[PDB]
Amino acid sequence: AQYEDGKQYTTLEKPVAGAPQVLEFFSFFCPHCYQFEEVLHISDNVKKKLPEGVKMTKYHVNFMGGDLGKDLTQAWAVAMALGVEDKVTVPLFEGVQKTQTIRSASDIRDVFINAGIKGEEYDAAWNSFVVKSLVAQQEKAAADVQLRGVPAMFVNGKYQLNPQGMDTSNMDVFVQQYADTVKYLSEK
Numbered sequence: 001a002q003y004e005d006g007k008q009y010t011t012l013e014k015p016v017a018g019a020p021q022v023l024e025f026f027s028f029f030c031p032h033c034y035q036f037e038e039v040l041h042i043s044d045n046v047k048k049k050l051p052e053g054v055k056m057t058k059y060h061v062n063f064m065g066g067d068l069g070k071d072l073t074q075a076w077a078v079a080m081a082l083g084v085e086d087k088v089t090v091p092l093f094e095g096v097q098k099t100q101t102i103r104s105a106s107d108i109r110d111v112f113i114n115a116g117i118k119g120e121e122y123d124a125a126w127n128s129f130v131v132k133s134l135v136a137q138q139e140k141a142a143a144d145v146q147l148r149g150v151p152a153m154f155v156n157g158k159y160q161l162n163p164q165g166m167d168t169s170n171m172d173v174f175v176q177q178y179a180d181t182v183k184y185l186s187e188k
Contacts, residue, residue, distance in 0.1 A: 007165045008181045012158055016144045019157025020057040022050065022182065025142060028072050028096045029064040030150045037093055040175050042151075049179045050186060058085075059138040061150055065096075071105045072096075077134035078112070078125045087115040155185040 005011050024043060026033040036042045047056055060076035062069050072092070079085045091111045095102035102108055112122050125131055145154060153161040166177045 003181065003184050007162065008177070009155075009159045009162050009185060012145065012154075012160060014146075016154075016157030019144070019154065020141070021054050021156055022046065022056045022186070023141060023154040023157075024056075024058045025061055025147055025150050025152040025154075026058065027061050027064040027069065027150050028092045028102075029069060031097065033151045034093050034097050036151045037089060040171060042175060042178060045175050046153075046179045046182045049183045051183075054186065057141075059141055061142055061147065062139065063148070064150070068102070068104070068108075071108055073138055074126065074131065074135055075105075075108045075112075077131045077138065078122065080134055081125055081128070081131055082117060082121070084112070084115065084117055087117075088112055091115065153182065155182060156188075159185045159188070161185075 003009070026036070043056070043058060050056070060073040062073050065072065075088075075092070076085075079088050088111055091114070092102070092108070095107065095111055102111070109119075109122060109126075113119060144157075145152075145160075151163075155161075161178065161181060163174075163178060166174055166181075168174050
């Protein structure tokens with residue numbers, strides 16, 4: 001065929017019931033994730049080709065960057081609860097990988113403050129049980145698929161995107177092939 005298991009995707013031996021339709025995993029420490037976000041705009045281009053009525057989910061992971069890795073997962077939980085993913089994503093990546101000004105939870109907080117979320121609002125979010133369970137979700141979703149690498153995308157809990165099997169000569173062509181694959185998998 002033109003889309004083959006083990007080529008543009010792999011199949012999970014252990015499918016995950018009740019999984020989000022389109023599930024993406026990343027880490028602010030993850031160098032390809034930086035590419036995916038800032039240069040390739042993967043998430044965005046996938047969304048543009050998805051049928052709609054389709055939920056898109058994105059979660060942070062713990063297994064990179066030790067202690068700060070977990071701070072970042074709790075902070076992404078804060079971003080999700082407050083709906084401010086799109087104001088903090090770029091400065092978190094640049095603060096971690098470009099400028100390296102993020103070294104503690106307090107520095108993560110500064111990014112949100114500078115993005116205009118109020119201190120009081122952030123610290124209440126940070127400390128809230130709704131954020132705790134949002135952290136639990138991120139971890140549980142990763143655990144459900146035995147996740148050991150990012151970036152990672154899963155469709156309907158059964159398919160995993162395999163970008164290593166796509167041409168990288170052209171970044172544009174890489175992204176479209178990627179998004180078209182998600183769409184293919186989506187209609188499976």
